[PDB]
Amino acid sequence: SLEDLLFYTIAEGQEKIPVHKFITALKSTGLRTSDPRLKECMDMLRLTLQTTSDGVMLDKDLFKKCVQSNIVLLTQAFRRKFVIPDFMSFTSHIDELYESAKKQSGGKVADYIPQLAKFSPDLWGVSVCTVDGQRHSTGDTKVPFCLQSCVKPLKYAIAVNDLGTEYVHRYVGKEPSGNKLFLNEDDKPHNPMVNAGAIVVTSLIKQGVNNAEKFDYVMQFLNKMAGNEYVGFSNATFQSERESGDRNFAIGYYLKEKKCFPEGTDMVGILDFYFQLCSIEVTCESASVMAATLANGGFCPITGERVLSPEAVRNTLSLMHSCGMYDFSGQFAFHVGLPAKSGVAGGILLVVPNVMGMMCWSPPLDKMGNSVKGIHFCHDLVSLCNFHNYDNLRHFAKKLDPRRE
Template sequence: MKMPIPDYLQEILDHVRDEDGGEVADYIPELAEADPDRLAIALCTASGHVYEAGPDADVEYTIQSISKPFVFALALQELGPEAVLDVVGLEPSGEAFNELSLDDNDKRPVNPMINAGAIAVNQLINGEDSSVEDRVEKIRDLFSRLAGRELHIDAELSASELEGADRNLSIAHMLRSYDIIKDDAHDAVLSYTHQCSTLVTTRDLSVMSATLANGGTQPVTGERILSAEACRLTLAVMSSAGMYDGAGRWMAGVGIPAKSGVAGGLIGTLPGQLGIATFSPRLDTQGNSVRGVKIFEYLSRDMGLHLMSSDQHSVPGVRSITRDGDQTIIRLQGTINFTAAENILHQLTTHNLGGEELVLDVSRVTSFNRMGRRMVKEGLRLLREGGFECAIYDPEGVVTDLEFSDGTTADTVDSF
């Protein structure tokens, strides 16, 4: 059976494709030359299933500030929260990402998602006495393991960024003046710039963010990379500061811990469920992808992904799949949201379904949200197109709309 999720993701891209607001990041020469029409989305579940849409899903671009949460998580794992929080705070800044600002009381950067905090955290990796080369390699290796493939650094773009790095150099000198970092200011900015110049794809970013959602276990390779504690604290900071001075509005409206990058990438993470990544280079005045923000707004509303929504339940979806002669009975249970529906459809694609008739038993389902209902119905339609006679056992009437997207309806049975 063909999974309907890529088609749904393509629908979202079509929905935002004509949005042409914003501009590419013109203060970095290579980014100024980016194709503004690039567009892609990828989604990775905590169970390791990756879905993508858009011809640009495998186009490489630099990770930029999306690197910040992953390096923060690495620092937490290497040194522990207490040592990391000695050099960086956890509070939203309410200021631009490159503001020359420190906490008025203790002179620490206020959080690790702004440049001052990210440069300070970068200097913790591999120890304060590490060379730039060893520190950068430690970070590049982390990113590669998170993505599940070998990643590389765009040296040309990194050199270009360094030529215009006066702001970050000023930040580094400020950090040195308060003994927040020990390294030479130029070396600190060099290390941080290499971090931001790592090349990734939208698919890579979805898997990397899903690793945070999965408590540090890479969902595709199964490798334990980060601790659950490091991921929890990282997601907490993303939820409050990942979208800079727009973080409050973002969490109220979208409700997904997120981080943006000026190359046009944007990630979001739902704890225990999935990682999402989008790519579209046009940025708004805050440095966030215009179409990426629209996509996340659409996903949050349509799929019920808002972190504070009552739809947020982690349920298996499938109770059992049994065979009785020519009839296969698929019993569902619990609340069927996107995560449960994806699990249901994935089990149906991998299960050796036999016979001629399929009955979907929803008698133990407490409710369907809109996306869960749509995905399960589309799965039934595709199975029917594959030659099965499909029916639903729904004694409580939890599936209120049985019409498929092609205008036909599903049969119902009173018993089986």
């Protein structure tokens, strides 16, 4: 009877519902028709469109046949049970923040490698994926770009997922440095979000196998986090990174000298693996799904698959909060109060826990290496919405709570 109950609410007193009406109403919830959790429904709608005696009409029996396999998710979407029930209104707010941030033309595109330097400063995109799979994009959201340091929290969650907090943190610290030092007083890199930390974390993953097997193993995790949306690789960026990596070779030799790597590590191979991990490509859309997996406790919103352990996600979000934005980590944690991670390509992987994931991208960076438009957008998002980590959910002054209505 759930299919019947849904049928009557969409039909609006009519005997049959046109398929375009059902599809339009489904899209207004935030879900895409291409959502992996609605495939059985969409395949049945397509097949019935082929065999139907009607033009585009669906009676109670035909509707039941089409929607029965995905009735649970469809009932939540149509009964406004998603984390942001009025999704159309929220995306209109996102579009306003996107336009406001678009006006901030300052910053300098990264030019140490030609692959980053080629990007237009005007490229600006923002994608949202809620913990329920509601999607919204504005701007250049289907343009590939390298994750760069945005991969640091992702590989750290993979290390914690497989090894646990205790083992992983025998090699890397868990606090901000407060910085040019590679090691803290305990002779460990400060945290996984700095280069020395990321390099030590890279050395922890899938130990014992060649870099090709390690890379594939990581890629499978990223595919699952992104709901099998675009996760690619730029060998052009990789070759340039490995060529101009004096800074990372200094870290590598220092770490090896200070015995920072697990026994039996080949540091030169680990740096090579690290340069490969930085050169992984995403779009705003696919990377917003990875950030939504982090907002959703390790479950991929658009698939329902458990990708990461709750412990891996909590630790990752803890360290993104305090160490994810370089020298602006403390200011960002204070004013924005959201777990975020930036990369030198212009990415800002943003998590609003229990609500949504985002990817903001604009190549021009500020003097701290963070995307000008992304930083602007993040501040405006928290000015508008009660998404700050320490904003109250009952008493939030002139802020808007999109979880309300």
